[PDB]
Amino acid sequence: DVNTLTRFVMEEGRKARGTGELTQLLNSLCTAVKAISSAVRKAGIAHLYGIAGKKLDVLSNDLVMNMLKSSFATCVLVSEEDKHAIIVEPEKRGKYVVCFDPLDGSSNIDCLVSVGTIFGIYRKKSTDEPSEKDALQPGRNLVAAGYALYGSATMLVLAMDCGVNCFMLDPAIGEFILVDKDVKIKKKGKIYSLNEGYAKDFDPAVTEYIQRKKFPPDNSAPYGARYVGSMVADVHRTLVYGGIFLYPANKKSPNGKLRLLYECNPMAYVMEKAGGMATTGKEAVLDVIPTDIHQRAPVILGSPDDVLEFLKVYEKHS
Template sequence: MDHAAEAQRTDLMTITRHVLNEQSKHPESRGDFSILLNHIVLGCKFVCSAVNKLFQAGLAKLIGLAGEITNVQGEQQKKLDVLSNQVFVKALVSSGRTCILVSEEDEEATFVEPSKRGRYIVVFDPLDGSSNIDCGVSIGTIFGIYVVKNKDDPTLEDVLQPGKYMLAAGYCMYGSSCTLVLSTGSGVNGFTLDPSLGEFMLTHPDIKIPKKGKIYSVNEGNAKNWDDVTSKYVENCKFPKDGSSPKSLRYIGSSMVADVHRTLLYGGIFMYPADKKTPNGKLRLLYEVFPMSYLMEQAGGEAFTGKQRALDLVPKKIHERSPVFLGSSDDVQEIKALYAAAAAAAE
């Protein structure tokens, strides 16, 4: 028996152990972040279990609309949306490490009562892609974490800061497997839930997005409303003028987690541009654009709004929207160049 290979095979790296290893590099660390992350992981496990039950015919009662409830975006909520939001809010508050929570499903930010207050702000979309629940497409949870300036006197201004100041970001994808992708500011790692152990195990260490990809991802149903730059870029994807092969279109839609996960692993570009119908973009800045842009940059990619680096944007309100182009650096640079040329021509 190859004892070295056997030792490596049994040296299982859980997400908790991984984070503790990262925190050990910072002597001043008190373990608060590990506790917070454990509560986020618990929420992800709960939602994963609920999603799996939903996919079983015997538990179809979870399918359907939650009465007349709509969220702040005016979208109908599935029962699982409501449940997921409640689970994460309770898990985050009970961790004793949070002071402000911003959820896609809640109109106002949640300020944690002083007795349970900690120094972290968590922004999150508890169930991204919920409109795809009934057809079995991968859905997920997206989150970002900031540090508050003064936990004894937190204000909404503490939330409205650029994504570049995030401490950590990640997403958990619920599909054929349950995968949690996380960055704490020193690269990106992917963990897959082992149902037999009930633990997220490191399966995708140090994820690096390819410098250039062969896939573009965009809702072409909005093409008639695009600006000239987006139209030209997509035309170049289909009919490249340099003699290279055309890019392939891959777009799941309504499930940003699934589209971004594929882009992160295989390369290419994910686009949700501003257009005539949604001039300010459609994706939410705090809990969709920022966390995904943070992960892309940490993996060696880029994220661009059509005007500037996505992580440099300063939010003015918690549910603000933004356009975004994110993915492989060469692909994002190409669309940056097109916007720069268009701006120069307009002067």
């Protein structure tokens, strides 16, 4: 029996016996993702080049912002594109807070590298008028999170209490088809992923861990390396094939490089619901209590056995 994102979300929402807001929020997000996908694949670019005689990152942010506002299900929206949190006007306010990266990896979009949209949804905790503070909740409080990967094909990965589910976008009918149910990551993988160009500035624990991947002390087979440079692409591969992904702090970026609210937490949430792990090295990414919407956070995630191994090394140097 075929299942669609719309059908799947509607059913889960029905079981929750709530107001239906999260359902509308996700439906709206889904529509925005399809619009972003269409623009990313360059539909209509011919008109830009004069067949008849805005930047993608900006368009993507506009699509998400507008669809979420018009869903009547949100009150505070934090985007990687905007310096300040966006406060939804009173007549369209809902009880949810959304932190998102409209188009992850767009910086190197020129090379047609895979790009994506990352999102994390929280239920407003405070009763105060909506403000940026409502987005400062630990990832542990997420009600839903995931991402859309615009790679060889477009896929939406949605994680919630019921687990992780993957939907493939069928461009013929503009429908997200459920192709992988209640996904779980491999206990242990054979791929490590990180920008080794930072080698010179790596912390000792990262240096040793990577060394163990290339020169297994037990003389087992060395791990293969992959690093697309786009978090959504690297994380998704990690989910599908297992292994480990790292974007640790650098000497130059003492608090890591990736952002906690819309890059780390969402992926950490997907990973844990898939039976995986995500740590800053000191604690679970999901337990970090944010003080700034754009603060950075180090992150090491993936197969449990792989992350545990890294933590062992980390502890040795602590």
